[PDB]
Amino acid sequence: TVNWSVEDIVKGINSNNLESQLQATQAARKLLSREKQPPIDNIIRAGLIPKFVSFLGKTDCSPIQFESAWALTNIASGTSEQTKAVVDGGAIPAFISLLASPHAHISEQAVRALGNIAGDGSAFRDLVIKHGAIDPLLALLAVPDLSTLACGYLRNLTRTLSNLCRNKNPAPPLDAVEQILPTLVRLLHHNDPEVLADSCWAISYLTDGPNERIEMVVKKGVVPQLVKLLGATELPIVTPALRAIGNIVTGTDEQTQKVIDAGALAVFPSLLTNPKTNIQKEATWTMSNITAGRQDQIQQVVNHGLVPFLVGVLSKADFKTQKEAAWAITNYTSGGTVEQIVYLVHCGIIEPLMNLLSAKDTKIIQVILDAISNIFQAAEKLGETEKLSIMIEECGGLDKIEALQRHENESVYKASLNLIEKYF
Numbered sequence: 001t002v003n004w005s006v007e008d009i010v011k012g013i014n015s016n017n018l019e020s021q022l023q024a025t026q027a028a029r030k031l032l033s034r035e036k037q038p039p040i041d042n043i044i045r046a047g048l049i050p051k052f053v054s055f056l057g058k059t060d061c062s063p064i065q066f067e068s069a070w071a072l073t074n075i076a077s078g079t080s081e082q083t084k085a086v087v088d089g090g091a092i093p094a095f096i097s098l099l100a101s102p103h104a105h106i107s108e109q110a111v112r113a114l115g116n117i118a119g120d121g122s123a124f125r126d127l128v129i130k131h132g133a134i135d136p137l138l139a140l141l142a143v144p145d146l147s148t149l150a151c152g153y154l155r156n157l158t159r160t161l162s163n164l165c166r167n168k169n170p171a172p173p174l175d176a177v178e179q180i181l182p183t184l185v186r187l188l189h190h191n192d193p194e195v196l197a198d199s200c201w202a203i204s205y206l207t208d209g210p211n212e213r214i215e216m217v218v219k220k221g222v223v224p225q226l227v228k229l230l231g232a233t234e235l236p237i238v239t240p241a242l243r244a245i246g247n248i249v250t251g252t253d254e255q256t257q258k259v260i261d262a263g264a265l266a267v268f269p270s271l272l273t274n275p276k277t278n279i280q281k282e283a284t285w286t287m288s289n290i291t292a293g294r295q296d297q298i299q300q301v302v303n304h305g306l307v308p309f310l311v312g313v314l315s316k317a318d319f320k321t322q323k324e325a326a327w328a329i330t331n332y333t334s335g336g337t338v339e340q341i342v343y344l345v346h347c348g349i350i351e352p353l354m355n356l357l358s359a360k361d362t363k364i365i366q367v368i369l370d371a372i373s374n375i376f377q378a379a380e381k382l383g384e385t386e387k388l389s390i391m392i393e394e395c396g397g398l399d400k401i402e403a404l405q406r407h408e409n410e411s412v413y414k415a416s417l418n419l420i421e422k423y424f
């Protein structure tokens with residue numbers, strides 16, 4: 001069945017010989033598994049999807065169920081229009097019936113096919129849910145110990161469940177999320193790196209929304225496990241774990257506190273120096289939504305030794321990361337006590353802050369300028385306003401601020417002039 005033409009496949013599928021149809025379907029499946037440019041569109045144009053879908057129901061002939069399920073899975077893993085062709089052929093209810101197949105390799109294909117369809121987008125996600133996929137999917141995981149399941153099979157179930165958690169506008173139905181979450185919590189404790197990665201992605205999707213979505217997740221007790229995975233060695237795990245934690249700290253101060261209470265801040269020395277740029281970037285963004293919290297939460301950042309790491313990120317990092325660092329400092333200086341803001345200067349924030357004021361980005365400049373203002377405000381409460389003026393002179397900051405009086409932006413000009421006057 002290697003190297004058939006689409007014309008030969010169609011000839012075999014149009015014979016009314018179940019074994020000839022089986023041969024041709026397998027030929028189609030191998031064509032569609034090809035690495036180089038599989039002829040998905042040619043198979044679709046030939047009108048083969050509805051025949052493949054009808055073969056999903058031939059319970060008398062499990063091999064042709066398998067080959068047609070795999071063929072359709074491959075098509076559904078392509079472009080959105082390709083995925084739509086599969087859905088338009090009636091594949092969704094047929095695949096959901098195949099979840100009850102006694103043949104593990106056949107129910108597995110149906111799991112994968114439904115994951116590919118649900119992962120296309122919110123509409124297909126919700127259509128898969130409306131056809132009732134969740135109950136039969138969760139039943140396949142209703143075992144006392146996940147470790148008795150075949151490794152590849154458990155990974156496909158995890159991947160498919162995370163795709164049912166994925167995408168927004170809208171987010172998934174609340175009742176669907178509640179139904180899935182307990183099984184997701186269990187997968188999040190399973191010791192396979194790929195199951196862990198995909199479960200973390202699932203949690204990152206569910207926490208990417210309003211505070212009530214976050215609370216659903218936080219109430220399940222998963223934050224300690226997320227923090228544990230935040231320290232994993234595998235970057236495919238750390239990345240979604242860090243995303244989930246970062247989402248959770250965009251919520252309320254009480255939700256942020258659960259992350260702190262679980263020990264998250266002790267991982268940030270590594271995260272804020274991580275060789276992977278996006279980890280450093282997302283770790284610094286997370287920090288900024290922690291320094292937007294309460295003064296006792298700022299104080300935890302201090303106690304964990306993280307101000308020097310923020311100074312470090314400001315001084316040298318990818319620019320996008322330095323931008324988040326700037327944000328973290330301004331949030332820190334808006335909400336911090338006077339003692340806390342003084343500590344920040346004593347750690348060296350001023351010189352790296354000044355040096356970023358020469359960046360060809362207008363947003364960061366207004367963020368840095370705001371932070372400088374909030375620091376002076378604290379300097380006033382101590383009268384050491386004079387001494388701060390000097391520091392900013394001694395490192396080239398006054399040169400930088402003077403020129404910003406004359407900037408394309410008006411909010412930039414307003415703030416810079418308002419400072420060169422009020423303090424110099």
Ligand SMILES: [Cl-]
Nearest residue numbers: 188189190191
């Ligand atoms: Cl674990």
